[PDB]
Amino acid sequence: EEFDAIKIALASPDMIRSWSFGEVKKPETINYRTFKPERDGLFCARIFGPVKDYECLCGKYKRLKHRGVICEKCGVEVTQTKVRRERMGHIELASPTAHIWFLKSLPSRIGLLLDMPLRDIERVLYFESYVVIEGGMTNLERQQILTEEQYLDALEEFGDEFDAKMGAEAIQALLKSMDLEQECEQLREELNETNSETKRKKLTKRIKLLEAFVQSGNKPEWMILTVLPVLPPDLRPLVPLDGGRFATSDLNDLYRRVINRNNRLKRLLDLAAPDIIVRNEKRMLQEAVDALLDNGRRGRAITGSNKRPLKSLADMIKGKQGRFRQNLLGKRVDYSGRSVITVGPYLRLHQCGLPKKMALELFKPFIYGKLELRGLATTIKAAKKMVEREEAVVWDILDEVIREHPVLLNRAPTLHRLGIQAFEPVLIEGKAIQLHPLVCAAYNADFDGDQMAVHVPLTLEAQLEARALMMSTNNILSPANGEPIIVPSQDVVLGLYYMTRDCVNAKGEGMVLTGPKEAERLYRSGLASLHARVKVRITEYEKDANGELVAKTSLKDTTVGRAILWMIVPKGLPYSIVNQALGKKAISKMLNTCYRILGLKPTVIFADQIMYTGFAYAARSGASVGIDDMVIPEKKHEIISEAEAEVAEIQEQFQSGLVTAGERYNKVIDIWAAANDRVSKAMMDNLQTETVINRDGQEEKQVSFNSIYMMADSGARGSAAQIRQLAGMRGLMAKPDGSIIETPITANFREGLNVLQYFISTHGARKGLADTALKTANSGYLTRRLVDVAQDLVVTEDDCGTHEGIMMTPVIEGGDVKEPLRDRVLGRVTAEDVLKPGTADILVPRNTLLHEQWCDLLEENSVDAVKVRSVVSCDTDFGVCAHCYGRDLARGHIINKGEAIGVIAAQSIGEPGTQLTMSSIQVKNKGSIKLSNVKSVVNSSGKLVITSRNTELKLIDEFGRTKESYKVPYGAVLAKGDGEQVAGGETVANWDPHTMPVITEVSGFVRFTDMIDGQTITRQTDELTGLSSLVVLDSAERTAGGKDLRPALKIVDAQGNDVLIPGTDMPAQYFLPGKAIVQLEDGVQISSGDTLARIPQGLPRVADLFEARRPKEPAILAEISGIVSFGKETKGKRRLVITPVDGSDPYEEMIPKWRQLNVFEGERVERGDVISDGPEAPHDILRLRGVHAVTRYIVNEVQDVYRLQGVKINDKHIEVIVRQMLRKATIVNAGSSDFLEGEQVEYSRVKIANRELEANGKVGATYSRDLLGITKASLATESFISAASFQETTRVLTEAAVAGKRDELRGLKENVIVGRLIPAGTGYAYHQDRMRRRAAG
């Protein structure tokens, strides 16, 4: 068994000879009649083997009497058959041919070896003419074509000392000639003398490459083919059909082609034919080879009479139709079934239907073995005939066998784990599968013609997994997020919401009950109202003492429904639980609380009884809909007459040649909107409490029985928008442009539609539908590419003994808290001693599991940031420590080693991603104000205005939480200064839409400077008012004469000097950008707060965030600190001369100057500071900042995008998938290894755990971190197997084999593809057995 690793190197022709069992010489396959093998063709039975076993063709020698005998009658060996799968032939060629993937693949592995270019050798081998096979005199070069009339000069010059003729043999001899060693050691010897610049690094490239081939062990001669194996017959079969028609694999075609051309070449070379035909035959042989190797890549594909091209070998490994994706990873199943589904309303949780027909079909082996055991069917003829005749015992024994015999259930698409579960059978003669209605949601399944599929645990590990793991009763929480999956579907909730209700109108007000018994006696007798708050007695309990119930009774004036319900409650809770009208939120929290304190089993029976009861009385509750449940409001004609008069006025306005259309058109839409929103009011007023039903009085009105508001209130179906679109206007409607129609839906469904309103709705319907049907692929790719990365994490030390790691702060932004820090802290270890807002009140000694005693202790405290020894910050090499991960969620305790995940992440993230694609600063409420890192100014008017783009407003509450978050234009006009307090509901900024003002706080003379007609600007009169100045065009419109120089109308005094900014020694003029149009002329004076210039006016991003593609257009954050200055002057984009304090200046990046900047031409930035208004590449963050800041940036952005959509995932996933991004360690120094070699950060830690230690102080090198993406990490892997599975298998196979790779089969897909166990799951015990063995010698 045991393995470490093994070596590989190229295919010897000796090896194909040894492997093969006989030359194939012919293309011939069979006879025309006697459909039987051909000697020395492709199906040579004497080579590959016979059909029967230990027998010769005559049948002399047989059955291991004559074991290693060859029947000399037919010369046929007495040998066995499973080798028929093995035994290959071979083929000896006329002339050498080469392997295309050593040739056409990127860096060639043969051209990169020689470093002599390609097209040279192409024409050497398209034989433009004679060609230097060997420039014996280096005067002549190899790979040098010599024409029939130029060759003679090489000839009569040297004659002897050159070989300049045709063929692949040129390259053969080349590879055989070149010697790698002494180049290597020489390049080293002169590396030591002067380890030069680019010169030496390419010396070094070669030196290490050379030695890599040396010590790796390689033989680039076998880059070139001389022997060609023959794939066995049954690897490329040829079979008949019923109608005599035959059927084949396309490979035989190419096999025949190659053999025929080769034999014809054997002919032409015996005749010394004119070698032009030998060239053509050589091109043809190499072509047929290369098409066996890769046909449709070279040129126009080869096709039959079909005109369709024919599949090669490579596609049988590659993409879909290869082994991997189609039928090695994903199979067709034995003993399965599937059919249409319907509801089981009277199921228990563990149950499922089984039409006994398919019960029998799948379980015939058990019932047969059992009919033999009893012996009624004495033989299998008897059992099969008895079971065709359907004995009565077949039924009782089918029940016997099926009793306690779990089975799986599968619906397409299997998004996450819970789409497939395992229930107990319930045998039925109903052709429809019955299904416990509550797991309609995990399946996303609703009964509109759906079919489920079914699978059979035969073995006992599978049976017991089905019952312990897939079971309906071990799965009660999403691991995406710890919510219950037991939601009331839509009916028991409607039921309960009806029961525990509290009217005023029906009857039976204020009498007394000793308890819910006479509540049921009354309500089942027909006396009380279920919905009537009537005095009763309760006797709840509580476990106040140490798990010790505490009895008590009391009275509570409560409804008949809550009363009657309360008995279901399992005597541990208070009555306030049931003392409201049971919203489904309450029901979530009910089974929550139930599970929490009780453990679980009550919550089980409890929920069963509640499903039971709500279904029962909801059928007794009655629910329907009527025409008058939607309205004919009394004010229907009057609204029409009013709208009639309004549009008549609009008509006459149009008649005038005034309001012309846009004002008119928008006016018309707005008035229609308001008119039928008033209709909506009329109607919802004319239903809900219109039932005036007196009772013992004058009159009283009460909620009428519409059923629409009720089914809208529980959460079953509907909501205010549904009810308006039935009632009021159906908002506006956008035609396919994305613009918005300005004459709406006026009517509704009851009143009656118009043809074109309908037709406009068809557009939005169709657009949204095509979005739905065409993004299952998008998640498809994102999920599956992420999973193919999937490796694991295993712990090794109790605590790494290491220090702090990550900070925890909650995720409240935009709205309320979205992850309590109470939860974020939950189960983790503290980085450190942590205090309370009563400070120096330590509560951990640097590390404690902070279970909810602590998280609640600290929810009690308003402490607002804590740190955690992170799994990242765990410094245990080749693993982590347990405290740093914190808690196992399933165990609910600090985690134990070995179990690990990450497709869990994939399901959690992808499964919801299916549909979930479809100026001002304010504070809202009281409290302190904590806004900073902004440049702003008290503008001319006396309130705050931004002058650094960074700020985004937040509406902070009195405790401190952000209630709202919104963005703010630079240079805006506020009515609030931050650090004030305001009543919410206020336009804090009344901004001008077009003007972006250019106010001059200074009072100095203006005069036209820096700015001249038709270079930096135009000067172009403001036509409407009529006065002007120098008029600053945008970026592209001005000519490039002065586009290289910033236009700045300048302020001066009577002296001409720089009117410095008031309070500082800084000059004050404005490098005017586009639209900055000054209206008053040269020499004019401006005032304080005076405008020189007036400036008028998805899931794809998910793909972008995950694929690590660069951000795109605009300028970015300060790359490096130190003074930064401007560069090359606008060849489209101007550059940025950075000048770091001690670092290096030369970096300069094209920036849109059209997109205005932040740091001026001689202002300093700190690194990682915004330069402009736009994003930055995350690679800038990893290369510039460390790891925590970058990963924080990414996870921030991505969960903002999701959280936007009403989304929730335990973000542990989004960080572990980023640990799996890339671990490429770009070395900083050299001395131990190369200077910037991509190495295992692991092995990096190893070397520094060896060399930097007293072996040296330091001889080696330090290292950096890297990114560049997930897919290339998939590629960039120890194994090539997991890499050579997915798309572009070809190039991966090339680069795999070229090293002679010999993967050690540890990763997931690695051991998978050979079907042997991998470290965990079922194989966990054996893997850790091997681990203890490795520890135990």
Added chain:
Amino acid sequence: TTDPVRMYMREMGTVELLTREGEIDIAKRIEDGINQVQCSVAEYPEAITYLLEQYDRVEAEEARLSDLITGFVDPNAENSIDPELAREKFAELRAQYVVTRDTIKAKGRSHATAQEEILKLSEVFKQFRLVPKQFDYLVNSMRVMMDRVRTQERLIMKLCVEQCKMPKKNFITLFTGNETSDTWFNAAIAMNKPWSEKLHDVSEEVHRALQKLQQIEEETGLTIEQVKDINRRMSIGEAKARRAKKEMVEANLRLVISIAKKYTNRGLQFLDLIQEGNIGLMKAVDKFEYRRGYKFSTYATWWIRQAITRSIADQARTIRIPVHMIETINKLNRISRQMLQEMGREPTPEELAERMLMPEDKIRKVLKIAKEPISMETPIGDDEDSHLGDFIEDTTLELPLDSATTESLRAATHDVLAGLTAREAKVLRMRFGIDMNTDYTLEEVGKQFDVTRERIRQIEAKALRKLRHPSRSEVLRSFLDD
């Protein structure tokens, strides 16, 4: 351009067509060189040992007019062979040879009289023009004997030069100047080379490889200088035609590519038909007689034509049709159409069969066999859902219930036969080959237990009644319905 058709047509596009005497000039250079290799035959060592012995060998089998003699003389008139004229024309040839030879001995090899008589032996010859195979073997008896001397020239050169040394410039003027004696050795070594004086430890095999060479002479009976002369005289006599034909072939390349691309419908393929026509043209270049005075393109069109018209028969199909069946099928797919003309509506095979001249069953059979196979990789599903390979079922290996039935059966037969007398069970088991690899006979219950044979019949019968016995026949009875 990746296409070899552009490359090839541009490459044949290089050479032009040379017509109306260069064709006949190719033929004349060819026949001239040929005539001179048969001259080289006329001046023979043992290699030939034929010229007239061959004619006595073709007549020695009491009468023949068969394949060989149409490989022999077949003279052109510048036909059934009456042997009268055969025995006529050979007399003067023998007279010429015998009268030439004694003068070839007079005063020298090729004395002026002798040389004019060799010239007469040549002028008498050039009105003959004859051809294949045995004459090919006649000259092969000179080709292999060329390789006798080169063989020894390689052996002794290897065994001498590669351990010793020597110069080259002296060697040619020394070796060709005498060629017969070793005076050139002591003349080369007349001076010095004490490295030559090192000649020991190999001596016994050097002049034993020279033994192998010198014996070639007496085999030949012929002097090494004349060996050199007539061998070169034959080799150039080959090379003449060898390069002369290529002119014709390069001319009529376009003849070929035309004639072939007349039948490059979707029958097989362009370049293969073009190749086959090129074969037919070379047949024409080789066979053409300018003395008929006809165009070559007609002749080459015949050869090109037949070449392609039957290569497309031998080639072009996975199921190898012979020619005769194809000729029948030609008759039918010709005659059927005359039939539906005359008929004017469908000829189901009795309104077809008669005019074909063959009965119904042939027309019907061919109507069945015209199904070329139907290529698994086709999408029988209009969508890319079911290539035919998916539908195919495999009824060859076994079905597991059958394995179980057989196992239960023979287990029950073991359980039934287990309880007999040893002789009954053993003769039965072995006699029916039960549980081994033999086919045992009652001749062998004879030859093995006891030469008694018929009591084995009456033992088998007793065992069958012992074992049919329907307290036992019922584990057998479920197998009545097999």
